[model samples]
Target: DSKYQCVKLNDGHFMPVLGFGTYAPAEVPKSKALEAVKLAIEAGFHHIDSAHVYNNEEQVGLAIRSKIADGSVKREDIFYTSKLWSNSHRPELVRPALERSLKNLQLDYVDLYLIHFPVSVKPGEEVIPKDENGKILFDTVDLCATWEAMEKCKDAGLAKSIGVSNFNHRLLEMILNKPGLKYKPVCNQVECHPYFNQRKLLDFCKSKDIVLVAYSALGSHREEPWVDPNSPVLLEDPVLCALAKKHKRTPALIALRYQLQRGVVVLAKSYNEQRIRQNVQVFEFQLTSEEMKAIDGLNRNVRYLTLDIFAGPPNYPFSDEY
Candidate 1:
């Protein structure tokens, strides 16, 4: 079990560096998530990433329980992360939202909870409430106040740690520099890869001692309705493929190893059983400094997921450079 390493967060919690992501497109069967999560656990992934909008928490929870029942791992051995959706961004609704996720999870608490996105929509059960014209209904809740409620959740032991996702540096600073701040965000989960490396933001986060967790680490699922069909694939890059050939590993491992070498916490998601087992080999090899440089040179600042559908909100974080 100690074969895998962890990165200590600003709040003194240890998060496993490699997490198994449990997001599937709507077209995919929900049972796939349960099976994949169980397989990931058997394959040695200690961190499990999920979200409310994914609408599969119950299945995920069942997978974890089945694994635990079979004695594959214990609850404390696994680090589970859940998110608060845009519909529950208000201060009063924050804890209730986490409770809802916990109810669905059938767990006492989540290891880490995050504000799913910086922008908030109108408060309701709808994940993304839209008006009559198919436009998003944005809300005006104060993010700092939301952070305070997150801190309260931590104090109440509902969540061991709290953080944010899809937030830019300015949005992070808003919480960091908030007056009477109780707990700093331990990490920021964002879409990161060689294509959109997030160098400036990563550096800024390092300066503040916040860990950066990467999603879409292996390009992405490229599922329709969220990803643009024309976006370039990260795993198919000639440089990464060439490196994989040189190292005798898969292109997916090369992309993931590149992030691990950069001190980033990475998530590798795949429904395939063989790939799920193979991804654990990322720790078996090391990338040289020159190879790292070559990968760094591949950054073009392109984003596969623009999240443009959620635009027109004042708190949209992508408008800033980093």
Candidate 2:
């Protein structure tokens, strides 16, 4: 096994260094997601990343289940990830939310179950409960209670590992320092790439032995109403373009490979059949140290996927340096 690939998690499971991200924009139809995921498996991706809020767990599960049924792969060979939305922040709601996701996937359990965000929403089936003012409503709860429920779920084999996503240092510290802690988060999935390269956060996670998983590696985020339309594009950067030309690869490949060289588990999302195959090509080549630094210089501290709507919430993660 190459040292640059596959990280052994704190929970004793090994996750692939590169995962196929299953997030699709609202405009994209379910048929595209369902078909693309099956192609990702045919293209040899071992990990598939998704969330309850992403609203496509059933399709992703359908792909894997179909693959297994046809003898293309086994359930044990795939590392499936699902998340608990903020609406399920209450201790009582955690298991039920994951159970709902498990039901959607038609699987008994997920390899990894993460708290989608540090931000909480009022407990309900509505993913985001909003006030009459149109502002999103927030739920407040003791995270220890939330985490206690997570631990119990893992104990019951509802999940193989439990972790967090979009958490900053303070939020992570809150969990690490909480009383009667049963387990440390095995990974922290965040919006990371050349433009908003989370170096400080990555380093801190390293120091704490938490694997930092990166999303938006290509920085081609789906259109969200909350986003500014005129923001800079990450893949169009001149430096990445130049490097990709030098290596005879697409700029997207260079972006994905850079994160792996630094030891981050990266998720590559693409609905197109060709691009889905292209993303797994990251493992076919390696980057030199100077090439790594050249991409590092492109960091502008810009966060394209920032959750600005949650700014009023106490656990909003972008304010800190990391």
Candidate 3:
């Protein structure tokens, strides 16, 4: 059995299906970040998913480098993914964002670089771009502009691959229809799990040969400043817990395998050594198609990381779609 599974993108690069997520809670210390990343690698995680917004890229980079130094893993063996922040989405600021992430991660290049969101808001600028009557500000720096710049990065060897994140079906359709795009987005990173399965979006991306990377795989309920009290608790769900018990695995692993069996890439995040190690054990068991269907029924469009803060005052991009 292969511990690693690869999905060939339209761009001809293969992405690992199981990646480590580096989304620490708002107040999580740097030490915790380092420990989690190191443990994740030791536990068989070859792909690392991080972002400039996570504020822990330095530690993650260090851990990856240390692992390579110790002969535990090779640089090419690890698929590193990072995002270009929204503030830096401006055409001129795009390179700066990429440079900043590279500096923070201490890496010359990342395997896959993603635009964190379809919409770009001014960084640290509180006033939403809006017109009279207090409407939100919408900028004219279209995604094609940013995407062209991303392609330039790949051509210049700054990033191996370029992709999008948090895009809806309509937004993706727009990208597909855009002309002069040198590189089609190879993947779309979004929140996915047993709940909020995003079946339609996944099917569309699959049809277009775009890999779908799932974040918040185990119910990002612990994600601070974003986790909703009213949201359904995935770990405590009866269906998942019962399945885990029957399989002799933990609920977290069950949730992750649900995505893996569906052919979606999953990012499992944890700080605890035990849980981090256990997350990698997902490949040891397989979920039958019937079990997969049962898990699919868990979808209720329950999104954990609702970008409400991003939507406020300014009309959000997906406010009407979702």
Candidate 4:
């Protein structure tokens, strides 16, 4: 159905152009994410994006299983994605990281797995290790070495596809230049939207046959601590507001439609049922070139998640020019 418009990956799998994000912290009760995921599927969302560090995969899995059991969708009808935590960047830890996510999702395998960050953390009792003073503990692991591990995961079928997230051009180049590389990264997940539109990175990924997956397509939920409390609000922009009014739609749908028109696979993350269903409307309308230009002009290159949590660790990814 057109409701589930998809793009073909290099690996020959179809990825939904829009996906529902199931990332929630432990502070958010499990039931909220579970219900939101279930509603998202009922609203015709065929893609679900999650990460091991999200701490909500069990609930997300429950929603998927429930939807399948009810005949609303088959397992093959969905494209599921999860990520490896920074703590598990070692070649040895890759399989176990994906296995744990498979166990959490109650599924045989994930459609895709991603390295959560360009950097690694000290693998110990926690995924995000911190020093006594609460600063993040960084471990310098060769990312190319990590990509070799990711290749093994695909070969073993632990994940149908493997990629990276929060990676910049240098890190991507490392993997591309890896001696005897098995597979190129099929996608690169990053924070992107009208305000923080990653046009440079988007072009780079496209040239390398890597799909750029956009997060914060509408705006950050502002739930993460890394996001500035007083950051500029994307949905409040006069341009987006005016476009939404002209289209007789909510500001979020306008923002989402803009990303889809740009050929970026986007994620819509919201816990509200009405909003989740409303997000599905993104597929029903098209943004004209003139309107798309208007939205592009709103770009000020503002980033919401700066990874301030990992300040001064090593090779902090945000220092470069996309």
Q: Using lDDT, give the best candidate's number.
A: 1
Q: Give lDDT for model 1.
A: 0.93
Candidate with best TM-score: 1
TM-score computed on alpha carbons, candidate 4:
0.96
Residue 177, candidate 3: Cα error in Å is: 1.5
Alpha-carbon local distance difference test for all models: 0.93, 0.88, 0.82, 0.87
Q: In model 1, what lDDT does residue 125 have?
A: 85
TM-scores, each model vs. reference: 0.98, 0.97, 0.92, 0.96
Task: State each candidate's clash count.
Answer: 0, 0, 2, 0
lDDT of 2: 0.88
Better of 1 and 4 by TM-score: 1
Model 2: runs farther than 4 Å from truth? 1-4
Kindly indicate the candidate among 3 and 4 with the higher lDDT: 4
lDDT of 1 at 299: 96
The superposed Cα distance between candidate 4 and the true structure at residue 28, in angstroms, equals 2.0
| True lDDT of residue 125, candidate 4 | 55
Span of ten consecutive residues with least summed lDDT in model 1: 1-10
Task: Report the Cα lDDT for residue 204, model 1.
Answer: 91
Model 4 Cα lDDT, one tens digit per residue, 225-296: 767888888999999999999988988999999888887999999888888889999977788899999999
